[model samples]
Target: AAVTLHLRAETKPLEARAALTPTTVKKLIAKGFKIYVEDSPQSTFNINEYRQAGAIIVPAGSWKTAPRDRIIIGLKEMPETDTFPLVHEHIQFAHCYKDQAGWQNVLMRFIKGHGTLYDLEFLENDQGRRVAAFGFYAGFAGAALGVRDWAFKQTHSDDEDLPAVSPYPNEKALVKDVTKDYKEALATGARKPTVLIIGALGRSGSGAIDLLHKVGIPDANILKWDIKETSRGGPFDEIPQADIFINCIYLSKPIAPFTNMEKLNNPNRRLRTVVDVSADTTNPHNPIPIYTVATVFNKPTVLVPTTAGPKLSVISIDHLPSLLPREASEFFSHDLLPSLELLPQRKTAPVWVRAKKLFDRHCARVKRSSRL
Candidate 1:
């Protein structure tokens, strides 16, 4: 006898997992999944058909409007009212994406690109178009310490050999107390949380690490990965157990060979949690499956922006920083944008170039709507 399973889903504000019609279902069945969706003159909400098939994936729109009992992963969250009638324990997953940490990383990396150490102050581009910002202080400060000591050994060096972005006036020295705190955190011998960082050497990954180092996650417990050479400053040695893994790898690469894969695969070992800031769920790449791995492993995975997934997909928003449009704009304008001044060849701040459309829109609006 041929086994059969029934399922139902809607398309309005469609969900990625369950947005298929009968034709789509046939295609999926051909590709290999056991879902038989209902077909009618007009697509109706059929709960029985779904139960017969073994599972139902309800759409954000119809599922929210129609009363049903089954799994409901939606593109959006259901209002509290609609949830009251779900008979079976329905699981809802959202497609909305979030990545505050990723955005912060990009912002930090962009500024760091235009700088080094020594002069320790913002410099206008050779054409005098850009100016560095206060955010560059850390990069400058780090460089200053390194360069000063290096210069102590160099008996005969010309000014021309110095880095252009050095001697940042606005640079702030790394506090001795803060460095000591990081050492203490590493030395505490506490059961460190397993933090998984994908793309551990990408601009965002590096920024995440720097920020984490600043915040004090023990160096020993952090699991960083990338298929390519991720160690710009050092080498990766062992795959350690993590307490809270961070996914900083971009989704373009496969999601295995994690530093702790052996431990994670070990039935004897207990795993921990994950924080995914990777931009994997946007256009391509299978983050859901990666997330599913976390789920099947019984790990609590938090997608940063949503703090959960059903209502938030932390990697889908294209220019994710735009989600907090105004706040991010302010940060770039004030905290992050100023650093571009140090790039010797930059005619204008890269941030201004990048956001020119937004600025132009504002200009057009002002011309049309302003009184003066």
Candidate 2:
């Protein structure tokens, strides 16, 4: 029998994303895979759409009680359940492999249940690079919010505040809305902000640059810096000179920060806004360590006080792609489709095999460290 893949709803309220889309679901069905989709009001893709793509619709949260053979899939963490043992083979960005706060409890859940976790982040190619990612959309949305917050800070009165960030109906709608607001801010005599994108050559950086262009930002007003520009390292004076700064670096190890709190707090600083597309705030290796907690869609921007200059408005929503769920899902699903083809033979296929091996290694290390 072909393996059954159960698609579960994401537990996070703000996460309206999906691991697979109807287009990808149809492709999977054509490839001899059996798919069961859980109905979710939060999903950007409707239930009927999945049904039209030949997916069997089950009640929401059905994956919790699904059969052992059904490999469960989702975009975020599973909901907290009273059921002690997590028995199903699950796939997602568990975020537990790293020694994140409370990561042990999550790993122990799988250990106690004898459940297998094929962490999406660990799924890599032969080169060990991530095989699939949503970095482009993540960058796109991060830049959009950065621009929006910049406009608000530029034009809003002392008592006025920027509206909470929310998911857009579509890509076109998002572009149109931001463009209008940007013009309105400019009309109020606010200066047009110059944007600087670090890690500009990569996926997220490219996406951020694309959105900047979409909002009619001229190329001359935008600055891009990759490894070459940053090789000299630390306290990059150009950082605070820009009106808006977008950090998009994908760092695996520690390096000198592009700019530090001292520079940001400097009275001479011109940097007024920041968007951390990387969202590596919790990581010790984070190049931009200005914010400790990530901002969310509901309250997207946090203001950090400066000793003498304007306080910096920082936007660091971790799940930027979720704000554009439809477009992000389509792009992500397309990239992930090829890898999904290997699941049936995961033990042998290079991609899945790599992911499984990583999971095992992490599980073993965590168990051993705990003296299990």
Candidate 3:
């Protein structure tokens, strides 16, 4: 009949986001579902907020021992310190589906525990769009950093890197912080910076566009391109011409490089910052192949070795959404609420069923490879 949902504490270092926020917890409880939330020190949402939402507050890591029927949910992958067998149905972004490094080991744990994994990233609707995603915030956060770094390039000495970025408590505060840097850069008589965003029609691209406009960048300064503009792709001149480039496309397959060393090494290259919201650093088919390292918040940018251009750096943080975890969690959980409502009938619900089938399909490959 009814389903019980438990929110697991996120153990990923510096990850303050949640898979389910207090607002959604209250909504689920009203629908006769039981909800348990862990007391997470790192979560942007206070434990008291979840308690006020009527969720039974449990100690951190309690999901490991919770009853089997309770469906456990979290925002990030589990920590490797505890590789215990997972017996409950779990939902989270496992990051193993993309043939990523050590992806097999990640899946083997679920197989060993006989647990069902519903990867949040792959959850889709009937028409094949993601049910819920962190893409919007990912783009927003990426653009913010990209602009901040661009501003840094303008005012700071070429020898120094942009300082580490910390997560803001909210969107308004973040915009204000970024705007301050932008204004400082302009005060030095720097011209308005043009921003080029690929995949500008999708959620991530839209988020980046919103950030750019909100920061007072004129519409003309923002070049938006989707599939249509990219139909005849590779080494676009606009990329190096723009002061900042933010790549937001979801790279599904191998394709031509969006911009190349030859293009980036242009003596006239004005591009000082590249924010790769795609963050497919390890993927061989990454459209932005200029950078090899997956940069992090502590050291966000990896400079490309362009021989002729002025200093250019790339921001390839895989979890850009964490920069605005509070809003990102609320936004994602809001979209995911309806799917959670169908958990009682998950066995029959197309959304959940499809996720399960995808999980099974991947597990089959894991088993087949284990023999070797």
Candidate 4:
């Protein structure tokens, strides 16, 4: 009956919830939910308290104190410093990355010792943020279609049979539409949109390109840039283009020196939209182009962050998946739950060995009643 489950992290959920709101908790509670929360700031979380609550949900990129026998939803591979506690206990974790659902199976082996996609639903909430919850659910639901034994059989029946990638609403057609709209805007007298993409060949960037193509933007007119050339042999790279500029070269720092950046394209007339989906840490000293360009030009930049929208980007925030609480939980549970259930539940082998260490350490010292 505990449907209205509020999330607590070492950080204040007040601001985080504004984006990854627990409206699910409210609705579930309205329809009968046993909801509770013990908000703990990321810098001051206690693992022992998490164990007492019987469930402790952890987000990516944080510091915590947790225990075993308690349920946890980790977004990425646990940072070594954060995993010094739980050497043995029933622990579940979710990983970030992989636009492919089959990746969940791989993740199960990596984390819980043994698990499936469904068991790991707890971690699939949007780009690791709860905002991407709905999108995350949709991805899982789409993945489920191919996960069925019969579906897998059909997909893998031949050597050409690769994993059937789940289709999101924003597939080829969506990209085509985006391209069409841009063209129409141009035809209507609008200047060509100057698109800036971070990690264009990276998983999300490539997906965006696929979508852009479907939307009708020919690869020629688009300018692609990234710090490294990840898709050197990607088939899409073969296309020739007179208008599009593809800068897949690698760089350790910003592409332009501070002085050169001052000569950036005109903010209003030359700039269009800046799209960034990279995981580059936001360091003011080493600011990325998208940040400066968008700010200087006052243009709209759509970068996936847990705080941007509910589970919308799904990078790897803990409660970000809670944006679509049920689906997020389902994804992690599906991927991790089964594997966790299979664990000896008494070994010290280390589940998500990184997380086990973190949980076992801090989980013993914190009070479950700790609040924001």
lDDT of 4 by residue, 313-344 (tens): 11211122222333343333344332333233
Best by TM-score: 3
After aligning candidate 3 to the native by TM-score, how far in Å is the CA of 221 from where it should be?
Answer: 1.3
Residues 201-274 of candidate 2: C-alpha lDDT, one tens digit per residue:
99999989999899988889899999899889887889888989998886747788888788887778878789
How big is the positional error of residue 229 in model 1, measured in Å on the Cα after superposition? 4.8
Say which candidate scores most in lDDT: 3
The lowest-lDDT stretch of 10 consecutive residues in candidate 3 is 363-372
- Alpha carbon lDDT of each predicted model: 0.33, 0.84, 0.91, 0.31
- Model 2 quality (TM-score): 0.90
- Please give the distance, in angstroms, between residue 20's alpha carbon in candidate 3 and its true position after superposition: 0.4
Task: Indicate the worst ten consecutive residues by lDDT in candidate 4.
Answer: 309-318
Candidates in descending TM-score order: 3, 2, 4, 1
Compose the digit string of candidate 3's lDDT tens values, residues 224-243: 99989888878788899999
